[PDB]
Every structure is written in structure tokens, then in C-alpha cells.
């Protein structure tokens, strides 16, 4: 009864629920790791001792927050719950592959945890650059277990990407075109395209790293003929597509939330949204060597790559200005998800502008691997992706669970979340400009004061997610239902009720061209 419903599940809503549960657990694992990092960096001195265990915590924080919080929740959970509901399909095209992708995820998590537990430790950073990740500096089984964790997560997300593209392209009603679908459907289409176009590159790269470790090859060994710059090339050829994967379903979620809670029938410039998402997807593939501006490339190569960053800056500017433009003359309902979306817009603008500052290779000479980079990627990830996850969760928690959250507690949670993240990641700009490098367990005294301030901010964010758990419990402590939802005609997922039944669209939608 339980085993056939959940362990043997073959519909999209249950797999999306299991995504939401697993990603909440893994996100709180990552939050504990982040509290540990900011506890080491709070006061001068070594609370933990050596930098090896600190690098283990840093790498674990990066992998757990990237591949196990934003990735499964965002793509899998929101796509599986909403994409057959937005396009009017009864299920996914290949539900067994979706179930297999979920059940490959906690093997990858267990392998990552065992990689952390083995006494060598995978303290390399989330870049797994050799010869630090070789069998000399890390002679042991931690790096191999890390590599197989990445293999399992990659196979999971390729299977999910294949399933998503075939269920979006094929399972539409035969009258609707691809430009009549909702925007989140477009975002997960382009996300699945770049996922299966980028993931085998890192699969091959860490396969060759594994054979360099344990099969005596010289792919990246400079004493045998190879060089680690090849590994950097393949890793970042995956890596910048990966962060565009991390941010694109967030774009779809915020577009849906801003369209809904302003009262609009549609986002302003739907063709502009579609064009800019395909432009960002097509153009994230040729910008990778902005992550290697200090490796010693050609000056013409880095000139090309910083021009590529400018031409990838323009279409997301079109998207953010059109997000502003669809707030025009709307009945602005002050929902909590609206506050998450406006915080998304402002803080993602700040993070993108700091990325544009970093995009010049001339200033990337100075600011490479400082905390200015950390402020850039946290202002995009830990604010934009996290705020988009929270906006989608607050907006669709009536749909997933059947109960409505307490909006007063949700507004308080947004307030202390905003204060905590803004006080955490604003002094990191000054620490990067002053010149503290990344991956440091102890700093000189002149970097102390901002570090102290930054540490305090992390604890505030802890309080945020602490009361967030209470919010969820409060919904199940209240059991307040939903009679009705406004604007249910435009949004298809709200039309079967809250929550929708197990079997939906047995009688499918009736839409005609002629």
C-alpha cells in the first residue's frame, strides 16, 4: 500500500513530492554546513584546527547546495508537479525514468556523505582540479566517491532532462503550438536541453580524472604529457551551463508569480521572454573561460570571452526590464510570494551587476578567487535561486498540500531572511576588494571586522529557515482549506482543485485551431 504508492510510484505528482522532501532535507544539510563555515570565519583563530577539514566542509557545502537543494527541488519537483498540469497532460511520457532519477539521487547523497567520512576527505573545493585531486595529495577513496556521486547525479538529471523534453514537445494538445505554453514550461524545456547538452562533458572529464587517479593515465599529469588546463576547460564547459541551469526555472517561477499576483492575464512581451531564454541557453555555451582569466590564456582569447559576457548580459537585461514592465497598472496584491519575487528582482540585479564587474579580465586579474566572487555567486544563487524556490513554494503550497500558509508568518520569514542574507553577503564585497582569498580558514586581522559582521548574518538566516519549518507545521497545525482561487481560467494547474486528484486529464482538454 505504501510501497506501491511511494517506492514504486509512476506519476509525476508523487515524484515531485519526494523531490520536495529530499531537497528540503538536503538543503538543511547544506545550511548546517554553511553555519559551520561561518563559525570558522567568525573570530580569528582555528575553531576546527587545520584547513583540510574546513575545505571538506566547503566542498560538501557546495555540492550539497548545488546538486541536492536547488537542482532536484527546482527542476524535478516543480517540473513534475506543474508541467503536465500546465500543458494538460495526464502524466509524464516516461514515468519510470522519472522514478529512477529520484531513486538514484539518495545513492549519490550517501556516496557524497561517505566521501566526506573517509579520513582523506575531499577537501578540494567544488572545482576538483588535479593534481590536488590526484592520488598524491588525496591518496584515498574520498575523491573517487565524490566522482561517483557526480556520476549518479548526472545520470539522474540526464534521465529527467530526456523525460522533460519528450513530455513537453510531444504531450501537448495537438492544436497548441510551442508558443502557447506557459513560461515555466519554456524554462524547463531550455533547462533540459542544456542539461543533456552539458552533463556528458563533465561525465567524461571526471571519468578521465578517475582513470588518472586509478588507471595510471596522464590526462592531467604534467610529468607524463597532459596538463590540468584541459580539465579546467571541460569542467567549466559544463560549469557555466550548470549555473544557467540553476537560474532558468527560477526565471520561469518569478515570471509566473509576478504575472499572477499583479493581476495580469499574461507577462508583458511573451515573445521577448521566449527569445531571451533561448538566447541565454544558446549563449551560455561559449562563455566558459571567464572562469580561467588568470590561468595564462591568450589576450585575444580573453578579449573574446569578456565580449561574450557582455552579449550574454544583454538578454537577461531584456528579461528583468520586462519583469519591471509587467508590473505596470496591475492590481498589485501584496502576497508573500510577491515579496520573494521583488527581492529576487533586486538582489539578482545586484548579483548580475557584480558579475559584470567581474566579467572584465583586467579587473579579474585583481578579483580572482577573492570574496568579491563569493558575493557575486551568493547574490545570484543564495538570493535569486533561493528566493525563487521560496516564491514557488509559497505560491504553490495550496496546490501541493491543500492548505494555505499563514501569510503573516510568511512575511516575517521573508523579512528576517532578507536581513540575514543581506548582512551575510554585503561585507564580502569589501573583503574581496581588500584582498582576502577564497578557501581560507584563517585570515589576517584587518579582515576580522567584516568577517565578524558576516558571521552574525548567517545566524539570522538560520532563524529564518527555523521559523520556515514552523510555517509548514502551522499549515498542518491549522488544516485551513481552499474554497476558491482567483485567476483560475488562465492558470491550468489551479483548475482541478487543491490538491488535484491522482488521475487528472483522463478526459483531456478541448482546444481547436479551425
Amino acid at each position: 500500500m505504501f510501497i506501491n504508492r511511494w517506492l514504486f510510484s509512476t506519476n509525476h505528482k508523487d515524484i515531485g513530492t519526494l523531490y520536495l522532501l529530499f531537497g528540503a532535507w538536503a538543503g538543511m544539510v547544506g545550511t548546517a554546513l554553511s553555519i559551520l563555515i561561518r563559525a570558522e570565519l567568525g573570530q580569528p583563530g582555528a575553531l576546527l584546527g587545520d584547513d583540510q577539514i574546513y575545505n571538506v566542509i566547503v566542498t560538501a557545502h557546495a555540492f550539497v547546495m548545488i546538486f541536492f537543494m536547488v537542482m532536484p527541488m527546482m527542476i524535478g519537483g516543480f517540473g513534475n508537479w506543474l508541467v503536465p498540469l500546465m500543458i494538460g497532460a495526464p502524466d509524464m511520457a516516461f514515468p519510470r525514468m522519472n522514478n529512477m532519477s529520484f531513486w538514484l539521487l539518495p545513492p549519490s547523497f550517501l556516496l557524497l556523505l561517505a566521501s566526506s567520512m573517509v579520513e582523506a576527505g575531499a577537501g578540494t573545493g567544488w572545482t576538483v582540479y588535479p593534481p590536488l585531486a590526484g592520488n598524491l595529495a588525496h591518496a584515498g577513496a574520498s575523491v573517487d566517491l565524490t566522482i561517483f556521486s557526480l556520476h549518479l547525479a548526472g545520470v539522474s538529471s540526464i534521465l529527467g532532462a530526456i523525460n522533460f523534453i519528450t513530455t513537453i514537445i510531444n504531450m501537448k494538445p495537438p492544436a497548441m503550438t510551442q508558443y502557447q505554453t506557459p513560461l515555466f514550461v519554456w524554462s524547463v524545456l531550455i533547462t533540459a536541453v542544456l542539461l543533456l547538452l552539458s552533463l556528458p562533458v563533465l561525465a567524461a572529464g571526471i571519468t578521465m580524472l578517475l582513470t588518472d587517479r586509478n588507471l595510471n593515465t596522464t590526462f592531467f599529469d604534467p610529468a607524463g604529457g597532459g596538463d590540468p588546463i584541459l580539465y579546467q576547460h571541460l569542467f567549466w564547459f559544463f560549469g557555466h551551463p550548470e549555473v544557467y541551469i540553476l537560474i532558468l526555472p527560477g526565471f520561469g517561477i518569478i515570471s509566473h508569480v509576478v504575472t499572477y499576483y499583479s493581476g495580469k492575464k499574461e507577462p508583458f512581451g511573451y515573445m521577448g521572454m521566449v527569445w531571451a531564454m533561448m538566447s541565454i541557453g544558446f549563449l551560455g555555451f561559449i562563455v566558459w573561460a571567464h572562469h580561467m582569466f588568470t590561468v595564462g590564456l591568450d589576450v585575444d582569447t580573453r578579449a573574446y570571452f569578456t565580449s561574450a559576457t557582455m552579449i550574454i548580459a544583454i538578454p537577461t537585461g531584456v528579461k528583468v526590464f520586462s519583469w519591471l514592465a509587467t508590473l505596470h497598472g496591475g492590481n498589485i496584491k501584496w502576497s508573500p510570494a510577491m515579496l520573494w519575487a521583488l527581492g529576487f528582482i533586486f538582489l539578482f540585479t545586484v548579483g548580475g551587476l557584480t558579475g559584470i564587474v567581474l566579467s572584465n579580465s583586467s579587473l579579474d586579474i585583481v578579483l580572482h578567487d577573492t570574496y568579491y566572487v563569493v558575493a557575486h555567486f551568493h547574490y545570484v544563487l543564495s538570493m535569486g535561486a533561493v528566493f525563487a524556490i521560496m516564491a514557488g513554494f509559497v505560491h504553490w503550497f495550496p496546490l501541493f498540500s491543500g492548505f494555505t500558509l499563514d501569510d503573516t508568518w510568511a512575511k516575517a520569514h521573508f523579512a528576517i531572511m532578507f536581513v540575514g542574507v543581506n548582512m551575510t553577503f554585503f561585507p564580502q564585497h569589501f573583503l574581496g576588494l581588500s584582498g582576502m582569498p577564497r578557501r581560507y580558514s584563517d585570515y589576517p586581522d584587518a579582515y576580522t571586522t567584516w568577517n565578524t559582521v558576516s558571521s552574525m548574518g548567517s545566524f539570522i538566516s538560520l532563524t529564518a529557515v527555523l521559523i520556515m519549518i514552523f510555517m509548514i507545521w502551522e499549515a498542518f497545525a491549522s488544516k485551513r482549506e481552499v474554497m476558491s482561487v482567483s485567476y483560475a481560467s488562465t492558470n491550468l494547474e489551479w483548475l482541478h482543485g487543491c490538491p488535484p486528484p491522482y488521475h487528472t486529464f483522463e478526459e483531456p482538454t478541448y482546444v481547436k485551431v479551425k
Binding site: 548546517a32 553555519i35 527555523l466 502551522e474 491549522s478 488544516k479 485551513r480 482561487v485
Partner: protein, 43 residues
């Protein structure tokens, strides 16, 4: 989104017990392992 009146409505005291339960259940293990790091370093 319209909301029904609560079928099993909670009061203020039970919500206080809930927030205190979350705080104590999240700060006993992490706070205990952070309360003595030098004991693990063979003091």
C-alpha cells in the same frame, strides 16, 4: 487564494510550544557538538 476557517485551530500557547520545540530540537545536537571542540582534539 481564499482560505477556510481552520478545522483544528491552534491557539497561541501551542504555537509557542511549537517554536520552542523547533529551537530546542535544532540547537541541542549542533550546540552540544559545538560546545566542546577541544575535547575532540584530545584535551
Amino acid at each position: 487564494v481564499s482560505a477556510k476557517p481552520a478545522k483544528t485551530p491552534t491557539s497561541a500557547v501551542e504555537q509557542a510550544v511549537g517554536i520552542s520545540a523547533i529551537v530546542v530540537g535544532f540547537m541541542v545536537p549542533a550546540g552540544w557538538v559545538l560546545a566542546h571542540l577541544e575535547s575532540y582534539k584530545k584535551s
